[PDB]
Design a binder for this molecule. Sequence first.
Ligand SMILES: *[C@@H]1O[C@H](CO)[C@@H](O[C@@H]2O[C@H](CO)[C@@H](O)[C@H](O)[C@H]2NC(C)=O)[C@H](O)[C@H]1NC(C)=O
Ligand SMILES: *[C@@H]1O[C@H](CO)[C@@H](O[C@@H]2O[C@H](CO)[C@@H](O)[C@H](O)[C@H]2NC(C)=O)[C@H](O)[C@H]1NC(C)=O
Ligand SMILES: *[C@@H]1O[C@H](CO)[C@@H](O)[C@H](O)[C@H]1NC(C)=O
Ligand SMILES: *[C@@H]1O[C@H](CO)[C@@H](O)[C@H](O)[C@H]1NC(C)=O
Lengths: 286, 237, 243
Amino acid sequence: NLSTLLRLVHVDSFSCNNLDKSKIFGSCFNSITVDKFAIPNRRRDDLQLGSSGFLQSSNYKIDISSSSCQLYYSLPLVNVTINNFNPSSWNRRYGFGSFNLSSYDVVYSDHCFSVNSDFCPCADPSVVNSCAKSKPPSAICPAGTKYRHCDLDTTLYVKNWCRCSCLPDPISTYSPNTCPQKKVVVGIGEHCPGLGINEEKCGSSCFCSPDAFLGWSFDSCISNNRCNIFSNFIFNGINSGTTCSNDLLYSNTEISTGVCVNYDLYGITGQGIFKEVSAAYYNNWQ
Amino acid sequence: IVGGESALPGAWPWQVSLHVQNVHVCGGSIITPEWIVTAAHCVEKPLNNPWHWTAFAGILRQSFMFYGAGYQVEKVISHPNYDSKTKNNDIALMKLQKPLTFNDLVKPVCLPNPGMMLQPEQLCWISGWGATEEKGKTSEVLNAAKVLLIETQRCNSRYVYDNLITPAMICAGFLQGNVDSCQGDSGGPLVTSKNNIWWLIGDTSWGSGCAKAYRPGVYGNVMVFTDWIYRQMRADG
Amino acid sequence: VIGDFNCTNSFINDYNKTIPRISEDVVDVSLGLGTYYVLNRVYLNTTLLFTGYFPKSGANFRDLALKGSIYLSTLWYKPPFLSDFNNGIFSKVKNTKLYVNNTLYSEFSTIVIGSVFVNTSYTIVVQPHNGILEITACQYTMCEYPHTVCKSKGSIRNESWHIDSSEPLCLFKKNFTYNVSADWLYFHFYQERGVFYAYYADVGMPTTFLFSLYLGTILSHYYVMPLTCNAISSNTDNETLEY
Ligand SMILES: *[C@@H]1O[C@H](CO)[C@@H](O[C@@H]2O[C@H](CO)[C@@H](O)[C@H](O)[C@H]2NC(C)=O)[C@H](O)[C@H]1NC(C)=O
Ligand SMILES: *[C@@H]1O[C@H](CO)[C@@H](O[C@@H]2O[C@H](CO)[C@@H](O)[C@H](O)[C@H]2NC(C)=O)[C@H](O)[C@H]1NC(C)=O
Ligand SMILES: *[C@@H]1O[C@H](CO)[C@@H](O)[C@H](O)[C@H]1NC(C)=O
Ligand SMILES: *[C@@H]1O[C@H](CO)[C@@H](O)[C@H](O)[C@H]1NC(C)=O
């Protein structure tokens, strides 16, 4: 029911794309997919219908070629919590923890990177021994992944000078093709594979420093002592399925006694006069 | 030359290879038919006695003669303020005893005038006889590649050279790699396209490998040494 | 073969005997057994002559309950176990009570009614979950070897009769409750003019109304899934399955 949804939720703005709100009040669909996430205060303009912002590039992409709606509602700050979890798999493989931020704070991704399975931010310590200038730390990488690519070469008089890849940082590197970490853009219904990891602060087992994870920021979402959360509704098919409306023609009207009224009760037609009479012979199925 | 292609017999008559002891070692370029411009690191003390030097022109594949059909170098003039440690002022001049009359596929390149107003990311071309991928042999055929000029301020970063480029030297190539010259590409004509005429503005002096990341090529800037070349020509006659 | 999908092929027997059982004490309508109340109508003190689908006085029953321990059988999913839903059936089932740590658990078999038991058709399933009847009629994906395991005194197998990665289109879904400590349960199923009806009763002679659904087709077949368990043997507590 549309009336019950907008009443129990403090709706602030509701707009639909490629769909009219007139046909929503009474129809039949196949399925409804709902996506919910918080709204950053500074990035509040990146949720428009078409924008190359930080949210639509690394957090969530909004499809345009499908009939969908946008719901902007607020939630009270009492008895509420925000879950900040990293959906990346290879990042937590090398010992990733949490952002460790204060309450009422959300984490958004602006620089996302995608790597393959054969990837290890760790160098072979047997090779780094012959290095004197810009010697990176090294440790034992688990099996199945190649070590960090580093080369030893002399320029004019420096015998021990080792050069590696992903310098200075994967966010802004001079040779993106040499570094295995490559920038990626999230698609329709896809998360970010992972964030950039500073190889200079990585590596016992290869354990990157918590400050080496770059390519993310945070911002508060408090507005009028309330938190802003976005909701997106996508309809799959129309004039079919079983997910129909309720307030189309039956809005739970009141019983009007005294005058004769048409009957559509449980599949029966006719007219008659109503009269309230106290009875107790009815059961829970009659 | 790495990542390039074989140079067709077009119009590139500004590459002269110097042969000593019947084997190619270093190349050079010509600006006037009385001198040869090349690097100075191959003109060290063990490489004295310029009488044992020959020059070939208009020869793409390095097999057309044997101890003959060449131009004997009369005298070689090098830069007096040359340092063997930092490799600064690495420009040498070789004078031929032959007139070298102009003919087909024989056309020198004019010197760059002061105030060229070169673009930062200017396009350039390289050519020479060197290895193919890494630590290879001398290429039998002539190959060429395309390079770009990078800024000296970006070339002096602590991760690429750590401030080891003098103001008389410039950097060029690609920071991503796969385009660089290996050992054996001494001298080399670094020309560019401007005003429908090529200008020799670079000269390969030294390098750190080829096709390696964060290790671009080093080319000598002949802009400062423009007055030094004119002084040697006037003092000759 | 019930469905058209592969559930499992682990230790499947070839054939067996599997003779049906016929019982005594035929129906007696002299007290109310075999009849059912009206759909949603209340009839006061009077005599009504109703023309409906009722069983014949003096008819025998057939035991279709199947119990397995380790191995299944191919003939279990073949006639005459796969009867025809001509006009309707009347079932008299009992709740198998199991006592574990002074706790009462009652489970019985599952009835499945349909037409061809395929994705492009509808299928009605009524399975009990510790006193909760889940009557759903969706377009499930039935496999060639449907079965169901017991919750209390679980077997060494897993319940797997349908596999679907997404929720299919369903026309009816609602749960019902009944007395767990009951002794016998009765059900009525029949169709007329393209609509389907269902009835259930835990205590008493007549039967109560459940729902009425419109399908537009004509169902022809029905089958009763076997209940694989371990506490329905002779060495365990003496109790059998009857349907
Ligand atoms: C239930 O219905 C029966 C059948 O009509 C009723 O029995 C008759 O009721 C009328 C009305 O009082 C009497 O005149 C007849 O003598 C009754 N006949 C018999 C055989 O008993 C019965 O009274 C009804 N019960 C009620 C209304 O409580
Ligand atoms: C009818 O009852 C069953 C059993 O309690 C419900 O099935 C449960 O559904 C929830 C929600 O998906 C699951 O978390 C449980 O695991 C299910 N239990 C079992 C035993 O399958 C079913 O949802 C109920 N139907 C309705 C319409 O409420
Ligand atoms: C007409 O009859 C109905 C039902 O008997 C009654 O409810 C209504 O009050 C009557 N109208 C008037 C004007 O008395
Ligand atoms: C269930 O059956 C038991 C035993 O007959 C009875 O005591 C109990 O009242 C019944 N419960 C209901 C809700 O009918």
